[PDB]
Write an enzyme that holds these catalytic residues in place. Structure first.
Site, PDB file in Angstrom:
ATOM      1  N   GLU A   1      16.449  -6.327  30.139  1.00 45.64           N
ATOM      2  CA  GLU A   1      16.598  -7.119  28.932  1.00 45.64           C
ATOM      3  C   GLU A   1      15.465  -6.805  27.971  1.00 45.64           C
ATOM      4  O   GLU A   1      14.329  -7.245  28.164  1.00 45.64           O
ATOM      5  CB  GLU A   1      16.604  -8.617  29.215  1.00 45.64           C
TER       6      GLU A   1
ATOM      7  N   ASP B   1      14.809  -9.498  33.751  1.00 41.27           N
ATOM      8  CA  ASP B   1      14.484 -10.460  32.704  1.00 41.27           C
ATOM      9  C   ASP B   1      13.178 -10.138  31.976  1.00 41.27           C
ATOM     10  O   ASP B   1      12.212  -9.679  32.589  1.00 41.27           O
ATOM     11  CB  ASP B   1      14.409 -11.864  33.317  1.00 41.27           C
TER      12      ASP B   1
HETATM   13  O1  LIG Z   1      11.645 -17.996  23.667  1.00 37.36           O
HETATM   14  C1  LIG Z   1      12.020 -17.254  24.818  1.00 37.36           C
HETATM   15  C2  LIG Z   1      12.280 -15.801  24.471  1.00 37.36           C
HETATM   16  O2  LIG Z   1      11.151 -15.336  23.699  1.00 37.36           O
HETATM   17  C3  LIG Z   1      11.268 -13.992  23.245  1.00 37.36           C
HETATM   18  S1  LIG Z   1      12.606 -13.787  22.027  1.00 37.36           S
HETATM   19  C4  LIG Z   1      11.722 -13.046  20.599  1.00 37.36           C
HETATM   20  C5  LIG Z   1      12.153 -11.604  20.362  1.00 37.36           C
HETATM   21  O3  LIG Z   1      11.836 -10.818  21.504  1.00 37.36           O
HETATM   22  C6  LIG Z   1      11.460 -11.021  19.127  1.00 37.36           C
HETATM   23  O4  LIG Z   1      11.990  -9.731  18.863  1.00 37.36           O
HETATM   24  C7  LIG Z   1      11.640 -11.933  17.895  1.00 37.36           C
HETATM   25  S2  LIG Z   1      13.386 -12.067  17.445  1.00 37.36           S
HETATM   26  O5  LIG Z   1      11.213 -13.260  18.229  1.00 37.36           O
HETATM   27  C8  LIG Z   1      11.973 -13.834  19.311  1.00 37.36           C
HETATM   28  C9  LIG Z   1      11.578 -15.297  19.411  1.00 37.36           C
HETATM   29  O6  LIG Z   1      10.214 -15.438  19.771  1.00 37.36           O
HETATM   30  C10 LIG Z   1      11.460 -13.043  24.426  1.00 37.36           C
HETATM   31  O7  LIG Z   1      11.640 -11.712  23.959  1.00 37.36           O
HETATM   32  C11 LIG Z   1      12.675 -13.469  25.239  1.00 37.36           C
HETATM   33  O8  LIG Z   1      12.829 -12.606  26.359  1.00 37.36           O
HETATM   34  C12 LIG Z   1      12.465 -14.911  25.697  1.00 37.36           C
HETATM   35  O9  LIG Z   1      13.572 -15.358  26.461  1.00 37.36           O
HETATM   36 CL   LIG Z   2      20.763 -10.164  28.725  1.00 35.42          CL
END
Ligand SMILES: OC[C@H]1O[C@H](S[C@H]2[C@H](O)[C@@H](O)[C@@H](S)O[C@@H]2CO)[C@H](O)[C@@H](O)[C@@H]1O
Ligand SMILES: [Cl-]
Ligand SMILES: CO[C@H]1O[C@H](CO)[C@@H](S[C@H]2O[C@H](CO)[C@@H](SC)[C@H](O)[C@H]2O)[C@H](O)[C@H]1O
Ligand SMILES: OC[C@H]1O[C@H](S[C@H]2[C@H](O)[C@@H](O)[C@@H](S)O[C@@H]2CO)[C@H](O)[C@@H](O)[C@@H]1O
Ligand SMILES: [Ca+2]
Ligand SMILES: [Hg+2]
EC number: 3.2.1.1
Length: 496
Positions: free
Chosen positions: A233, A197
């Site tokens: 991930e 994770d």
């Molecule tokens: O909010 C929980 C999740 O937060 C980020 S998702 C994150 C992404 O990695 C970025 O590339 C851009 S799309 O912004 C997103 C939203 O903040 C973590 O990467 C996740 O693992 C987590 O679950």
């Molecule tokens: Cl996943």
């Protein structure tokens, strides 16, 4: 780290999201084993904090308080029993390892945890591990807020608090060893691998250090010298500082571009057409096939979490979802993961679901059992996509054609495509707003085959559509655009 370690001939894993250990054990014996499923990805088995506001959300399981196997899914006893029972029928277990952080820094101190362990976020005290204030990255993060403010700086992404979660100092051997011992306990029980994770929020080198401490798999079910399957991930759609390739050395990586682009194509958005999928895979800018773990949707993006994305197909859009899942299962690219979810009441405000917090079906906090209906579907609001005929039969299709080359591609220049896998399988899709009628070369031996999308082969007959392949390999296909499932699939084992 790249080998799934599934029993030979099994090519997919299913995420039984929020399922209880006892229900998964039964599912392995009555269904997953006989139906050819390779494995099951389980929700985090370690103790987490209890969130009462909102009422028991699915995400409380991503806020660890200790490494004791005690959650709403069950206790250690039930977890061991599940692993044993599944392994005995040829179905592997893969654990969701939450190792980047502990619980939220702004959480209350007390024993409001799934197993009664105490924790004090304010003082960074986790007695049950044990972890103390210096086992965290507080002084390492350089942002004003202490959280991740920009994804263009790799340092804050990995050293700062992800949504206020206490960030573990993974550079320390104390922390590395504590995590490795937890993972090794799981391996000794019989687990085949792990989903790491939030790998994006940890340094590739720190993860590698933990992995180097892991034992070989249990010799009671696995060959000697077997290494655990590892899939990290890492959300990488491009445009950010961190790339998926930085993690190739540790094991497989989640290819989030796969579902985002497949969804766009099937929905026919932004000028995309299905005929464009001829060079699907690395030709589309995806990571190497032998490094990827693919899926249409996951537990996060099916509800707008993680990277989200409007193009993501889920069970809510059943007809298109089956087409996308069917294409994924038939195509040779990557190792496939099928999603299995629960239904929740959605409430869209400004184009976004504010009920995305809703946890699994429950009776005052206790997760409901998975009941099985006469037609093989599930009750109690468990969607069980893995039990839909169209999906289970494509899981079988993938096993039958394992290792066969992509062959006999055909398209109508729009949204009607077809392709085979060696001389053992063939699939035809009609995603156009009009009828499909062509005589395609299937590459299969002559005879009558049962379409496994509309039905099943039962004895010497088919319960659905029958396809006749003439002696030269050609067959006439007729698919209406108004058909319930606008695609047909036949393989060596569906032949009469
Ligand atoms: O909010 C929980 C999740 O937060 C980020 S998702 C994150 C992404 O990695 C970025 O590339 C851009 S799309 O912004 C997103 C939203 O903040 C973590 O990467 C996740 O693992 C987590 O679950
Ligand atoms: Cl996943
Ligand atoms: C890892 O992301 C998923 O889990 C997290 C943590 O449960 C939630 S954020 C959740 O918890 C934080 C920390 O206590 C508070 S304060 C920012 C937040 O309001 C809660 O939603 C995330 O939403 C999940 O995707
Ligand atoms: O194998 C069990 C059943 O699987 C599906 S029913 C499935 C449907 O295909 C989806 O579009 C939405 S409506 O969810 C349904 C399950 O609740 C087959 O179509 C059935 O024939 C089959 O009985
Ligand atoms: Ca981190
Ligand atoms: Hg806590």
């Amino acid at each position: 780290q790249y080998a799934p370690q599934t029993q030979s001939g099994r090519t997919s894993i299913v995420h039984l999201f929020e399922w209880r250990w006892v229900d998964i054990a039964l599912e392995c014996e009555r269904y997953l084993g006989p139906k050819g499923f390779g494995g099951v990805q389980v929700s985090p088995p370690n103790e987490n904090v209890v969130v009462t506001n909102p009422s028991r959300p699915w995400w409380e399981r991503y806020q660890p308080v200790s490494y004791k196997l005690c959650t709403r899914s069950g206790n250690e006893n039930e977890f061991r029993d599940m692993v044993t029972r599944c392994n005995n029928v040829g179905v592997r277990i893969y654990v969701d390892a939450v190792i980047n952080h502990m619980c939220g820094s702004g959480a209350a101190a007390g024993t409001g945890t799934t197993c009664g362990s105490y924790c004090n976020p304010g003082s960074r005290e986790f007695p049950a591990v044990p972890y103390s204030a210096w086992d965290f990255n507080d002084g390492k993060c350089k942002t004003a807020s202490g959280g991740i403010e920009s994804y263009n700086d790799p340092y804050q992404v990995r050293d700062c608090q992800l949504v206020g979660l206490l960030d573990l100092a993974l550079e320390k051997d104390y922390v590395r060893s504590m995590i490795a011992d937890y993972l090794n306990k799981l391996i000794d029980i019989g687990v085949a691998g792990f989903r790491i994770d939030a790998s994006k929020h940890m340094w590739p080198g720190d993860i590698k250090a933990v992995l180097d401490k892991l034992h070989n798999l249990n010799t009671n079910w696995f060959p000697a010298g077997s290494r655990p399957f590892i899939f990290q991930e890492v959300i990488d759609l491009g445009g950010e500082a961190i790339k998926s390739s930085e993690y190739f050395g540790n094991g497989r990586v989640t290819e989030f571009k796969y579902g985002a682009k497949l969804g766009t194509v099937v929905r026919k958005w932004s000028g995309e057409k299905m005929s464009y999928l001829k060079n699907w895979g690395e030709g589309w800018g995806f990571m190497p096939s032998d490094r990827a773990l693919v899926f249409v949707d996951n537990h996060d993006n099916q509800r707008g979490h993680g990277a989200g994305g409007s193009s993501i197909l889920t069970f809510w859009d059943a007809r298109l979802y089956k087409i996308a899942v069917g294409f994924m299962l038939a195509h040779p690219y990557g190792f496939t993961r099928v999603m299995s979810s629960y239904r929740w009441a959605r409430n869209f405000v400004n184009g976004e679901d504010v009920n995305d917090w809703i946890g699994p079906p429950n009776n005052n906090g206790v997760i409901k059992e998975v009941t099985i209906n006469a037609d093989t579907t599930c009750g109690n609001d468990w969607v069980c996509e893995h039990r839909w005929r169209e999906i289970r039969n494509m899981v079988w299709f993938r096993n039958v054609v394992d290792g066969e080359p992509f062959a006999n591609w055909w398209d109508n220049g729009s949204n009607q495509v077809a392709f085979g896998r060696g001389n053992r399988g063939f699939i035809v899709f009609n995603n156009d707003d009009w009828q499909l009628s062509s005589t395609l070369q299937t590459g299969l031996p002559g005879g009558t085959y049962c379409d496994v999308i509309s039905g099943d082969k039962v004895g010497n007959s088919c319960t659905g559509i029958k396809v006749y392949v003439s002696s030269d390999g050609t067959a006439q296909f007729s698919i209406s655009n108004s058909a319930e499932d606008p695609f047909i699939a036949i393989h060596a084992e569906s032949k009469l």
